[PDB]
Write an enzyme that holds these catalytic residues in place. Structure first.
Site, PDB file in Angstrom:
ATOM      1  CD  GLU A 171      -0.498   4.431  -6.705  1.00 11.57           C
ATOM      2  OE1 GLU A 171      -0.253   4.566  -5.490  1.00 11.57           O
ATOM      3  OE2 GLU A 171      -0.245   5.310  -7.558  1.00 11.57           O
ATOM      4  CG  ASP A 172      -1.140  -2.894  -3.182  1.00 14.07           C
ATOM      5  OD1 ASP A 172      -1.010  -3.887  -3.930  1.00 14.07           O
ATOM      6  OD2 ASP A 172      -0.217  -2.450  -2.469  1.00 14.07           O
ATOM      7  CB  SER A 173      -7.320  -0.062  -6.064  1.00 19.12           C
ATOM      8  OG  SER A 173      -7.395   1.030  -5.168  1.00 19.12           O
ATOM      9  CG  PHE A 226      -5.260   3.821  -3.689  1.00  9.70           C
ATOM     10  CD1 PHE A 226      -5.444   5.020  -3.032  1.00  9.70           C
ATOM     11  CD2 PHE A 226      -4.873   3.837  -5.016  1.00  9.70           C
ATOM     12  CE1 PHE A 226      -5.253   6.216  -3.690  1.00  9.70           C
ATOM     13  CE2 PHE A 226      -4.684   5.032  -5.677  1.00  9.70           C
ATOM     14  CZ  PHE A 226      -4.875   6.224  -5.013  1.00  9.70           C
TER      15      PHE A 226
END
Ligand SMILES: [Mg+2]
Ligand SMILES: [Zn+2]
Ligand SMILES: [Zn+2]
Ligand SMILES: [Zn+2]
Lengths: 45, 49, 48, 66, 263, 113, 144, 84, 49
Positions: G18-20, I47
Site C-alpha cells: 500500500e505504497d510503503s 501508507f
RNA sequence: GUCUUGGGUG
C-alpha cells in the site's frame, strides 16, 4: 571584548557594544561573529 | 465550539503498515506513549506496579 | 470471513486475519512475487 | 558535491578514483572504458562515478569569509 | 568433510568454492563476514578550525567512512568495556588532520593520506588509513581555497557493521550455487523458452549440464557454493574469511557456555 | 527522536538473559527457547543442523518482529533424548565443522602461495 | 534533486504494501538521501519613544521578569549565542529586554529555538536595519 | 406512579449491548474505588476483567431502569436479564 | 500509555461508524503509527502520507 | 498573543 570579522574585506577586529557597527580596514556595513571557543564533538554517524 | 471542539489527550502522526500486528492492535510511538497519559486510581491490586 | 464471524464470533474471526496473514506472508517471503516490463508484452501473433 | 568515499549499494571505496577517472576522460577514453580500467565492475559502483556531479568547484568560487 | 578450493587469491579478494557444507553454514559465513567481523573506524571527531565550505558533520561522516588498517584490532578492547572514564589507548587510536591552503591561488585537496597517527596501543599495527600503494593519495576528504583551514582530531574505535556500515570489512560477497538449476530451487520466467532467454552462470562450466534423458532427483541438496569475498583494505581477504569463521565459532561457544552454565 | 540505539541489537543488558528455556506442555518432550540479541544467522544454522538428527522430531524458529533483535525456537525430540542435549550436540557439531573448514581453508591459502 | 537508487520490485516481507517501501539501512549509513537543513531566526530592536528601546543583552534574573523557561547560559555578553554551539529545543538564541514604562524595570522579548528542532548554530549575523537600529540573524544547521 | 409491576414488563429479557457496556464500565469504576467484590478473585487484577467475571456469574448488584417514550419505566436487576 | 490500553483510532473524513474504531496499544520505536493491513479498508487508508 | 493573505498535505 568579543571577536568579530568584516563582511567585505575579511578583516578581524573586536568591538565593545558602544562603538557603532562598522569594519576598521574598509568601513563595511555587515560583520560576522567569530567561531566559539568551546569544543564541539560529532559522532561520525 | 459546541458541536465540535478541540480536545486534550489526543495524538496524530503518519501511519505505517505492519504484517506482524494483530487486527485490533495499533503500534504507538514511544514518545507519544510518554506524552499521553491515563489516570489510574491506586488500589490494593495495583500499588506495586 | 462472514461464515467465521457468524459461527465463531468476532474474536476468532479477528484472529483468522492474523493467522492467514502470517502463514501466507512467510510462504510468499520464501517464494517471491514480482512484476516487470515483460508482463505487459504480448507475442507477435496476438499483436497481429 | 564531492565524490562519496564509498559506493552506496555495496560499500566499495570510490573516493580515490575521481581524479584518475577525470584524467582518463581527458586522454579520450570513453566513460565505459574508463570505468572498466578503474576496475569498477558492478553497475552500482559504476553509476557512483558516472553520475557524480562535482559542485564543490562551484561552491569554492565564493570568497573565503575569514 | 568440509572442503575449500581457492580459485583466485589476491590481497583484496578471494574467490573460493565451498563444498560438503550445508547451505545454512555458507550463508551464515556470508552474513558474518558482512556484519560481525570487527574493524577500526573513526567514531569521534573534534573540530578545531573548519572554515571550508563543507559542514562539520558532512566531513565527520566522510572521515568515519575511511578504511583504516585493522590487522591487530582483535588485540584491542571495545571502548564500552574499558574502565577508563575519558578515552585511552587500550580501546582507541588517535589521529590528527591539519590542512591549510598557503598562498592565494589554486585549490588544495585534502586527502585521507594526510591523516596522521599520533597515539594508539603500540606496538599494535592498527590505525593507519589504508593505502593501495606506496604512491597512493588515499580518499578525497575536502577542498580548500585561500585562507581556508581544516584542523581535526579524530578518534578511532573498534566496532562491527551491525552498529554502522562504516565498520564493514567487506563490500560485496558474491554468492551462488547450482548453476544449472538441477535442484529446481528457482522457476524461470520466460516468453518463448527459458533456456535461451536466460544467461549462463559464470560457474556453469564447473558442473555437468543435465542430460535430456535425466529425471528429477529428490535426494540432491545443495553441496557446492561459489563465493567471492572483497575487502576495503582494512582487512585482507584471507583475514576476513578466517576471522568470520572464528567469530562464528565464538558465537557458538557463547551459546554452549550459557547452556552448560545454566545447569 | 524515536530511533533506538544501533548497539542494542547485539549488546546484552544485565537484566536480560542471553537464553531462556520454557517447556511446551501440549506435546511431550518439547521446549521453547528465546535467544536474545541474535538473529537469523544463528537461528537458521542451528535449525538446519538440528533438522538432520534422527532423534529430533520437530524444530523451527521465527523472528516475530524485525524491529526487535531476538528469535524464538521450538524443538522437540524423542522419548530418550532431551531437546537441551540435542542443542548442545548441534552446537558442538557445528563448531567442529567450522574448525575443519578453517583448517582446510588455511592449508589451501598456503598452497596457493 | 535526486539520487539513482537500485530498486527491486518484490513482495519481499510485506512491509512495502500500500505504497510503503523498504530501504537499505546500510545505504542510509553510507549517505543515501542524506540532506542538510538550515533554519534562520530574525530579530531586531524597536523604538517605542525617545529613549525607550529594546536591547540585545543576556537578561539577568534580578532586573528582568517573565523570563522564559529555557536556559540562558549559552548567550555571550552581547545577548547573542556564538556559532559552533549545539542548541536544543526551548534554548534561548537571542536575548532581548523590553523596558517597563513608568529597580526591576524590564520585560523580556527573547527568541528561543523552536521546541521541536535540534542543531548547531552556523552563522550569527549582526547589522542595522533600515532605521539604524541593531539587527540580528541567526542561522541554525542540522542533518536529517 | 411511573414504575411498572414485575408482571407486565414487556421489554426484552436480554441485556442489550449498551446496557452491558455501561454496566461493565460502572462496575469497573466502582471496583477501582475499593468497592467490595462479589466474585472470588483468583488471578486477575484489572477492574474491567473482574467486572466481566461478576457479570458472567450474575453477581453485579445493579439495576437498569428502562425508560419508555411516554415517561414510564421498567426496572430489571442485572442478575435477571439474560447475558449472551 | 501502555500495552493493551484501549484507544480510539480515527481517520478523516469519518464517513461511517467504522472510520472510528477502538484499538489495543502496542508501544514501539520510530515515529509512525502501525496498522494491520486488513483495517486499511474501513479507514480507507494507505501508507503514502 | 490576534486577524487576513498565500503555498501545500491526506
Ligand atoms: Mg493516502
Ligand atoms: Zn570591513
Ligand atoms: Zn557498488
Ligand atoms: Zn579505554
Amino acid at each position: 571584548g568579543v571577536k568579530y570579522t568584516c563582511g567585505a574585506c575579511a578583516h578581524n577586529f573586536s568591538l565593545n557594544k558602544s562603538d557603532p557597527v562598522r569594519c576598521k580596514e574598509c568601513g563595511h556595513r555587515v560583520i560576522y561573529k567569530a567561531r566559539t571557543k568551546r569544543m564541539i564533538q560529532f559522532d561520525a554517524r | 465550539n459546541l458541536m465540535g471542539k478541540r480536545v486534550d489527550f489526543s495524538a496524530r502522526t503518519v501511519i505505517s503498515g505492519d504484517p506482524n500486528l494483530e487486527l485490533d492492535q495499533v503500534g504507538v510511538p514511544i514518545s507519544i506513549a510518554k506524552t499521553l497519559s491515563y489516570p489510574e486510581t491506586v488500589t490494593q491490586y495495583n500499588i506495586h506496579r | 470471513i462472514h461464515t467465521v464471524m457468524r459461527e465463531k464470533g468476532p474474536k476468532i474471526c479477528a484472529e483468522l486475519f492474523g493467522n492467514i496473514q502470517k502463514v501466507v506472508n512467510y510462504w510468499l517471503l520464501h517464494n517471491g512475487f514480482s512484476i516487470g516490463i515483460g508482463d505487459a508484452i504480448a507475442d507477435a501473433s496476438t499483436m497481429k | 558535491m564531492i565524490i562519496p568515499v564509498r559506493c552506496f549499494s555495496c560499500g566499495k571505496v570510490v573516493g580515490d578514483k575521481w581524479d584518475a577517472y577525470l584524467r582518463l576522460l581527458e586522454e579520450g577514453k570513453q566513460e565505459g572504458d574508463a570505468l572498466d580500467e578503474l576496475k569498477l565492475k558492478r553497475y552500482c559502483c559504476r553509476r557512483m562515478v558516472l553520475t557524480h556531479v562535482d559542485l564543490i568547484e562551484k561552491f569554492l568560487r565564493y570568497n573565503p569569509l575569514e | 568433510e568440509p572442503k575449500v578450493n581457492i580459485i583466485n587469491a589476491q590481497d583484496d579478494e578471494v574467490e573460493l568454492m565451498l563444498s560438503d557444507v550445508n547451505l545454512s553454514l555458507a550463508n551464515s559465513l556470508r552474513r558474518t563476514m558482512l556484519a560481525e567481523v570487527p574493524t577500526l573506524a573513526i567514531d569521534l571527531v573534534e573540530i578545531k578550525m573548519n572554515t571550508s565550505v563543507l559542514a562539520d558533520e558532512f566531513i565527520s561522516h566522510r572521515l568515519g567512512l575511511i578504511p583504516l588498517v585493522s590487522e591487530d584490532v582483535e588485540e584491542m578492547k571495545y571502548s564500552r568495556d574499558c574502565t577508563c572514564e575519558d578515552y585511552c589507548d587500550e580501546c582507541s587510536v588517535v589521529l590528527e588532520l591539519s590542512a591549510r591552503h598557503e598562498g592565494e591561488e589554486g585549490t588544495t585537496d585534502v586527502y585521507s593520506s594526510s591523516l596522521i597517527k599520533v597515539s594508539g596501543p603500540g606496538n599494535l599495527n592498527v590505525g593507519e588509513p589504508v593505502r593501495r600503494d606506496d604512491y597512493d593519495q588515499g580518499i578525497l576528504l575536502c577542498k580548500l581555497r585561500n585562507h581556508q583551514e581544516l584542523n581535526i582530531r579524530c578518534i578511532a574505535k573498534k566496532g562491527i557493521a551491525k552498529e554502522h556500515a562504516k565498520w564493514s570489512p567487506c563490500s560485496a560477497i558474491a554468492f551462488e550455487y547450482d548453476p544449472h538449476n538441477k535442484l529446481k530451487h528457482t522457476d524461470f520466467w520466460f516468453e518463448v523458452d527459458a533456456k535461451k532467454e536466460w544467461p549462463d552462470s559464470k560457474y556453469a562450466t564447473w558442473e555437468e549440464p543435465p542430460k535430456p534423458g535425466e529425471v528429477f532427483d529428490y535426494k540432491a541438496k545443495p553441496n557446492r557454493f561459489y563465493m567471492t569475498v572483497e575487502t576495503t583494505g582494512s582487512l585482507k581477504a584471507n583475514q576476513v574469511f578466517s576471522r568470520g569463521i572464528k567469530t562464528l565459532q565464538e558465537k557458538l561457544a557463547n551459546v554452549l557456555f550459557e547452556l552448560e552454565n545454566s545447569r | 527522536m524515536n530511533a533506538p540505539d544501533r548497539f542494542e541489537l547485539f549488546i546484552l543488558p544485565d537484566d536480560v538473559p542471553k537464553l531462556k528455556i520454557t517447556p511446551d506442555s501440549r506435546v511431550p518432550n518439547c521446549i521453547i527457547i528465546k535467544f536474545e540479541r541474535e538473529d537469523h544467522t544463528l537461528a537458521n544454522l542451528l535449525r538446519e543442523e538440528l533438522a538432520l538428527y534422527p532423534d529430533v522430531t520437530f524444530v523451527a524458529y521465527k523472528v516475530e518482529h524485525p524491529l526487535f533483535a531476538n528469535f524464538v525456537m521450538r524443538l522437540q525430540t524423542e522419548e530418550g533424548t532431551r531437546p537441551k542435549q540435542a542443542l548442545e550436540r548441534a552446537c558442538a557439531s557445528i563448531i567442529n565443522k567450522l574448525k575443519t573448514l578453517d583448517h582446510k581453508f588455511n592449508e589451501e591459502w598456503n598452497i596457493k602461495n | 534533486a535526486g539520487q539513482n537508487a537500485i530498486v527491486a520490485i518484490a513482495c519481499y516481507s510485506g512491509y512495502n504494501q500500500e505504497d510503503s517501501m523498504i530501504m537499505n539501512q546500510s545505504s542510509i549509513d553510507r549517505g543515501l538521501f542524506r540532506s542538510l537543513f538550515f533554519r534562520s531566526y530574525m530579530d531586531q530592536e524597536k523604538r517605542f519613544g525617545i529613549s525607550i528601546v529594546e536591547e540585545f543583552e543576556k537578561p539577568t534574573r534580578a532586573t528582568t521578569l517573565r523570563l522564559k523557561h529555557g536556559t540562558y547560559e549559552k548567550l555571550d555578553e552581547d545577548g547573542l549565542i556564538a556559532p559552533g554551539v549545539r542548541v536544543s529545543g526551548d534554548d534561548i538564541i537571542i536575548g532581548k529586554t523590553t523596558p517597563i514604562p513608568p529597580y526591576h524595570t524590564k520585560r523580556d522579548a527573547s527568541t528561543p529555538l523552536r521546541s521541536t528542532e535540534n542543531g548547531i548554530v552556523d552563522q550569527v549575523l549582526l547589522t542595522t536595519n533600515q532605521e539604524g537600529l541593531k539587527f540580528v540573524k541567526v542561522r541554525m544547521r542540522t542533518t536529517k | 406512579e411511573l414504575a411498572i409491576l414485575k408482571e407486565e414488563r414487556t421489554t426484552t429479557p436480554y441485556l442489550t449491548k449498551y446496557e452491558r457496556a455501561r454496566i461493565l464500565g460502572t462496575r469497573a469504576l466502582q471496583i477501582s474505588m475499593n468497592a467490595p467484590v462479589l466474585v472470588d478473585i483468583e488471578g486477575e487484577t484489572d477492574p474491567l476483567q473482574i467486572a466481566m467475571k461478576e457479570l458472567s456469574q450474575r453477581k453485579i448488584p445493579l439495576v437498569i431502569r428502562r425508560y419508555l417514550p411516554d415517561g414510564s419505566y421498567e426496572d430489571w436487576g442485572c442478575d435477571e436479564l439474560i447475558v449472551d | 500509555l501502555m500495552d493493551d490500553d484501549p484507544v480510539l483510532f480515527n481517520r478523516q473524513p469519518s464517513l461511517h461508524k467504522m472510520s472510528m474504531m477502538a484499538h489495543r496499544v502496542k508501544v514501539m520505536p520510530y515515529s509512525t503509527f502501525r496498522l494491520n493491513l486488513s483495517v486499511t479498508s474501513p479507514y480507507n487508508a494507505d501508507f503514502d502520507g
